[PDB]
């Protein structure tokens, strides 16, 4: 098998069904003592979890899944009629994904877009009934953060106030976008300094809230 299904198998014996907290935790413990995996993990979570609660959006979407470690952690925080959306290219991890959020009892409020951002971001609006984003989480690969926020711009998926937020701006590291959205006067950005998840290293969250053109 693989360490995927490794920590889905190890949710499944460890954590309490329909209790994203325990779902959570459970993963946290399996990457903490076993294997890593490129979770958000718990220090930035929090800070995640801050920030959710302030702006309390309504329509969120998240490039990369991965497990659903982060689906089930914004979720969990989502009021009643709110929408997650994430987009997973990994078959494989899109299903686990899904799995995941059955156990934790959250899949009514997050669909899975099975495919490559590039290609489902222009088809937001027509297929899944979307105006405009409250908030996007970007975590998916480093060099894509750029090119995928300037598609949805073009798309007129941003709207004013509209908050990016970004992983791992520190490490592994994401040079062009970090240098364009601070750059850039359609965005005000905050840093908020934290560590690479399961580790002693610093790493960190760019929040980018869209001004509009
Ligand atoms: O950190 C990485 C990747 C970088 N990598 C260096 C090695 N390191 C690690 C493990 C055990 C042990 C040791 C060592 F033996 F060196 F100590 C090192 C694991 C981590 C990372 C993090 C993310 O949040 C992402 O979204 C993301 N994406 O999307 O690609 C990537
Ligand atoms: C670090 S993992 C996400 C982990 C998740 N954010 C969490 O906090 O547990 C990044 C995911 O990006 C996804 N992937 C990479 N590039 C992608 C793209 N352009 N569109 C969709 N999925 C992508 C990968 O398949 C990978 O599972
Ligand atoms: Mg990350």
Same mark, same amino acid.
């Given at each position: 098998?693989?360490?995927?299904?490794? /920590?889905?198998?190890? +949710?499944?014996?460890?954590?309490?069904?329909?209790?994203?907290?325990?779902?959570?935790?459970?993963? #946290?413990?399996?990457?903490?003592?076993?294997? @890593?995996?490129?979770?958000?993990? #718990?220090?930035? !979570?929090?800070?995640?979890?801050? +920030?959710?609660?302030?702006?309390?959006?309504?329509?969120?979407?998240?490039?990369?899944?991965?497990? !659903?470690?982060?689906?089930?952690?914004?979720?969990?925080?989502?009021?009643? !009629?709110?929408?997650?959306?994430?987009?997973?290219?990994?078959?494989?991890?899109?299903?686990?994904?899904?799995?995941? &959020?059955?156990?934790? !009892?959250?899949?009514?409020?997050?669909?899975?877009?099975?495919?490559?951002?590039?290609?489902? /971001?222009?088809?937001?609006?027509?297929?899944?009934?979307?105006?405009?984003?409250?908030?996007?989480?970007?975590?998916? @690969?480093?060099?894509?953060?750029?090119?995928?926020?300037?598609?949805?711009?073009?798309?007129? &998926?941003?709207?004013?106030?509209?908050?990016?937020?970004?992983?791992?701006?520190?490490?592994?590291?994401?040079?062009?976008?970090?240098?364009? +959205?601070? $750059?850039?006067?359609?965005?005000?950005?905050?840093?908020?300094?934290?560590? &690479?998840?399961?580790?002693?290293?610093?790493? $960190?969250?760019?929040?980018? /809230?869209?001004? $509009?053109?």
């Amino acid at each position: 098998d693989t360490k995927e299904q490794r /920590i889905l198998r190890y +949710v499944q014996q460890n954590a309490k069904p329909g209790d994203p907290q325990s779902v959570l935790e459970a993963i #946290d413990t399996y990457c903490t003592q076993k294997e @890593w995996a490129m979770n958000v993990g #718990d220090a930035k !979570g929090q800070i995640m979890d801050a +920030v959710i609660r302030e702006y309390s959006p309504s329509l969120v979407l998240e490039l990369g899944a991965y497990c !659903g470690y982060s689906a089930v952690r914004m979720a969990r925080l989502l009021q009643p !009629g709110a929408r997650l959306l994430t987009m997973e290219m990994n078959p494989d991890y899109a299903a686990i994904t899904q799995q995941m &959020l059955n156990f934790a !009892g959250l899949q009514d409020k997050v669909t899975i877009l099975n495919g490559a951002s590039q290609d489902l /971001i222009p088809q937001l609006k027509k297929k899944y009934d979307v105006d405009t984003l409250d908030m996007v989480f970007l975590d998916h @690969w480093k060099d894509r953060y750029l090119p995928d926020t300037l598609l949805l711009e073009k798309c007129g &998926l941003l709207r004013k106030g509209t908050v990016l937020l970004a992983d791992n701006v520190i490490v592994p590291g994401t040079p062009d976008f970090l240098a364009y +959205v601070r $750059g850039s006067s359609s965005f005000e950005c905050t840093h908020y300094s934290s560590y &690479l998840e399961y580790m002693k290293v610093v790493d $960190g969250l760019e929040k980018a /809230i869209y001004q $509009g053109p």
